[PDB]
Scaffold this active site. Structure first.
Site, PDB file in Angstrom:
ATOM      1  N   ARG A   1       0.748   5.212   3.446  1.00 38.52           N
ATOM      2  CA  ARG A   1       0.191   6.247   4.297  1.00 38.52           C
ATOM      3  C   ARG A   1       0.699   6.086   5.723  1.00 38.52           C
ATOM      4  O   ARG A   1       0.973   7.068   6.402  1.00 38.52           O
ATOM      5  CB  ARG A   1      -1.335   6.180   4.308  1.00 38.52           C
ATOM      6  CG  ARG A   1      -1.987   6.421   2.982  1.00 38.52           C
ATOM      7  CD  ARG A   1      -3.474   6.216   3.099  1.00 38.52           C
ATOM      8  NE  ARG A   1      -4.133   6.114   1.800  1.00 38.52           N
ATOM      9  CZ  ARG A   1      -5.449   6.181   1.640  1.00 38.52           C
ATOM     10  NH1 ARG A   1      -6.230   6.356   2.701  1.00 38.52           N
ATOM     11  NH2 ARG A   1      -5.987   6.085   0.427  1.00 38.52           N
TER      12      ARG A   1
ATOM     13  N   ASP B   1      -8.060   8.726  -2.650  1.00 37.86           N
ATOM     14  CA  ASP B   1      -7.808   7.349  -3.068  1.00 37.86           C
ATOM     15  C   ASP B   1      -6.627   7.306  -4.025  1.00 37.86           C
ATOM     16  O   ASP B   1      -5.957   6.283  -4.153  1.00 37.86           O
ATOM     17  CB  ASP B   1      -9.057   6.739  -3.712  1.00 37.86           C
ATOM     18  CG  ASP B   1     -10.292   6.873  -2.828  1.00 37.86           C
ATOM     19  OD1 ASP B   1     -10.424   7.908  -2.140  1.00 37.86           O
ATOM     20  OD2 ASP B   1     -11.131   5.946  -2.816  1.00 37.86           O
TER      21      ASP B   1
ATOM     22  N   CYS C   1      -2.847   1.459   7.479  1.00 29.98           N
ATOM     23  CA  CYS C   1      -3.583   1.750   6.259  1.00 29.98           C
ATOM     24  C   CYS C   1      -3.792   0.371   5.658  1.00 29.98           C
ATOM     25  O   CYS C   1      -3.900  -0.599   6.401  1.00 29.98           O
ATOM     26  CB  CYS C   1      -2.763   2.653   5.321  1.00 29.98           C
ATOM     27  SG  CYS C   1      -1.056   2.084   5.072  1.00 29.98           S
ATOM     28  N   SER C   2      -3.816   0.272   4.334  1.00 33.46           N
ATOM     29  CA  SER C   2      -3.986  -1.016   3.656  1.00 33.46           C
ATOM     30  C   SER C   2      -2.891  -2.021   4.016  1.00 33.46           C
ATOM     31  O   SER C   2      -3.065  -2.899   4.870  1.00 33.46           O
ATOM     32  CB  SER C   2      -4.029  -0.802   2.138  1.00 33.46           C
ATOM     33  OG  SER C   2      -3.241   0.323   1.761  1.00 33.46           O
ATOM     34  N   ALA C   3      -1.758  -1.882   3.352  1.00 33.23           N
ATOM     35  CA  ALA C   3      -0.615  -2.748   3.588  1.00 33.23           C
ATOM     36  C   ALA C   3       0.196  -2.282   4.816  1.00 33.23           C
ATOM     37  O   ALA C   3       0.999  -3.024   5.372  1.00 33.23           O
ATOM     38  CB  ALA C   3       0.258  -2.795   2.327  1.00 33.23           C
ATOM     39  N   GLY C   4      -0.026  -1.043   5.239  1.00 36.54           N
ATOM     40  CA  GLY C   4       0.663  -0.509   6.398  1.00 36.54           C
ATOM     41  C   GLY C   4       2.087  -0.067   6.119  1.00 36.54           C
ATOM     42  O   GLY C   4       2.963  -0.202   6.970  1.00 36.54           O
ATOM     43  N   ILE C   5       2.337   0.448   4.922  1.00 33.78           N
ATOM     44  CA  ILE C   5       3.675   0.918   4.601  1.00 33.78           C
ATOM     45  C   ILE C   5       3.686   2.289   3.925  1.00 33.78           C
ATOM     46  O   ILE C   5       4.701   3.004   3.956  1.00 33.78           O
ATOM     47  CB  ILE C   5       4.458  -0.104   3.740  1.00 33.78           C
ATOM     48  CG1 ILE C   5       3.886  -0.188   2.321  1.00 33.78           C
ATOM     49  CG2 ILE C   5       4.486  -1.457   4.415  1.00 33.78           C
ATOM     50  CD1 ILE C   5       4.878  -0.762   1.305  1.00 33.78           C
TER      51      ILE C   5
END
EC number: 3.1.3.48
Length: 494
Positions: A431, A391, A425-429
């Protein structure tokens, strides 16, 4: 144009600068040196400096009290056209009016720092072309500098290398006469609009820096050793995010705002994935400029239908999930797949979880996807949910990621049709970009072996121009180098 970034300043000198050289509205950004990977925004207000913090933990830039962003350049470009939007806790607004510009040329591409003359000559001779250039420290005169330009064609004597001397006398720079610039940057930028012309006709275009970052894949071990220049290569790559402030109009339209997990992190219009199955998804095509990617946010509840619309449309058969549904306290991606053996409808799309195959690092999920109505549209879509990413920051060994990507690579390869690979991933930028770049690089090596040319920063900037701020952290940067390195010595196993 990122001159408002000061990469070597402590917080306490940033007070002085804003106070001696600044006015109310004046601001700079600097790396937090109390939180490596973080940043601090300094804004002069009522004769007083106030430091606002920006966290970057791998997902995005989080303006403490502000919103969340893709790059620092996008953050600043935002607030300078959204006055009132930088409020403080107590309600009053902080205006970002005048960029306090930095003079430190280190993070410039063309700037080389130490370096001898002959050494630069070898380089400009071997790697250079017409217009290729660099600035180095003198050499004959400490404190002074030398610029070096190649001019000619493609031994011939038709090409040459000219050296101009840059004197630093009392804080300012010059080429021996004429104007005196405050920075090497302003000096350079100038002579790109207005090239120094020699007496006998010769014009010295500053047409491109000299590549300092491309390496042979085989000698990666040695190059890594040296960067342990890592923060410096990275900072130098950060400095070009200003060239990447392409429009994202479609992302901003009122109707699409609730399709964005983070309101400010948006697809470029020119590479957004348009739907013809509304047409909006927070998703960009990432094309290596054979095998492509779609980089995207994790599913919001009200988007899950689109996500499947897109996967169908694009004819994608492999999906890389890089995030737990909830992490560190907060939603990251809603479960958009059915439980094992189940069949679920998401609008006109339809998904059966056929099997789940838990590996140590990840869980695969074989899913049959189709359209309600036509039973022939059924395609197996292989979801590789990756489970073991911290995390906070990056993994220890790259091996795990690597073994995961090989499996993914083979799956994509075995399916002949197979459109772009979806990564999120979260925002996609963060990971997301980190896998995609790693995947791209390994793919190059894989097709050309160990004696080939790779260039990590060149590759990241290439991807960043397709979706905002891909690979935001120095840790992700270092990790990308560690993984490729790792990939090699396991190729030398045979």
């Amino acid at each position: 144009s990122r001159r408002w970034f000061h990469p070597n300043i402590t917080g306490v000198e940033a007070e002085n600068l804003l106070l001696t050289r600044g006015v109310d509205g004046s601001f700079l950004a600097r790396p937090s040196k109390s939180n490596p990977g973080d940043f601090t925004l300094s804004v002069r207000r009522n004769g007083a400096v106030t430091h606002i913090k920006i966290q970057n933990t791998g997902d995005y830039y989080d303006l403490y009290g502000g919103e969340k962003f893709a790059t620092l350049a996008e953050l600043v470009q935002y607030y300078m056209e959204h006055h009132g939007q930088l409020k403080e806790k107590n309600g009053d607004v902080i205006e970002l009016k005048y960029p306090l510009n930095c003079a430190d040329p280190t993070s410039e591409r063309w700037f080389h720092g130490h370096l001898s003359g002959k050494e630069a000559e070898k380089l400009l001779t071997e790697k250079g072309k017409h217009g290729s250039f660099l600035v180095r420290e003198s050499q004959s005169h400490p404190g002074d500098f030398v610029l070096s330009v190649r001019t000619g064609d493609d031994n011939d004597g038709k090409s040459k290398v000219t050296h101009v001397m840059i004197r630093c006398q009392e804080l300012k720079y010059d080429v021996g006469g004429g104007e005196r610039f405050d920075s090497l940057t302003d000096l350079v930028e100038h002579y790109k609009k207005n090239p120094m012309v020699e007496t006998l006709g010769t014009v010295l275009q500053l047409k491109q820096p000299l590549n300092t970052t491309r390496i042979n894949a085989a000698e990666i071990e040695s190059r890594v050793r040296e960067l342990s220049g890592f923060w410096e290569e990275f900072e130098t790559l950060q400095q070009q995010e200003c060239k990447l402030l392409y429009s994202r109009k479609e992302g901003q339209r009122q109707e699409n705002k609730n399709k964005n997990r983070y309101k400010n992190i948006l697809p470029f219009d020119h590479t957004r994935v348009v739907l013809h199955d509304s047409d909006y998804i927070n998703a960009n095509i990432i094309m290596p400029e054979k095998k492509s990617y779609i980089a995207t946010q994790g599913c919001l509840q009200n988007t899950v239908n689109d996500f499947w619309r897109m996967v169908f449309q694009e004819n994608s058969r492999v999906i890389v999930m890089t995030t737990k549904e909830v992490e560190r306290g907060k939603s990251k991606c809603v479960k958009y797949w059915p439980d094992e053996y189940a069949l679920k409808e998401y609008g006109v799309m339809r998904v059966r979880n056929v099997k789940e195959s838990a590996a140590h690092d990840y869980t695969l999920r074989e899913l049959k996807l189709s359209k309600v109505g036509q039973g022939n549209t059924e395609r197996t879509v292989w979801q590789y949910h990756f489970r073991t990413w911290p995390d906070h920051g990056v993994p220890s060994d790259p091996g795990g990621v690597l073994d995961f990507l090989e499996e993914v690579h083979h799956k994509q390869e075995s399916i002949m049709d197979a459109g772009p690979v979806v990564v999120h991933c979260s925002a996609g930028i963060g990971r997301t970009g980190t896998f995609i770049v790693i995947d791209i690089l390994i793919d190059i090596i894989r097709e050309k072996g160990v004696d080939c040319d790779i260039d990590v920063p060149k590759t990241i900037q290439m991807v960043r121009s397709q979706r905002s701020g891909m690979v935001p952290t120095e840790a992700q940067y270092r990790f990308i180098y560690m993984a490729v390195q790792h990939y090699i010595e396991t190729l030398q196993r045979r």
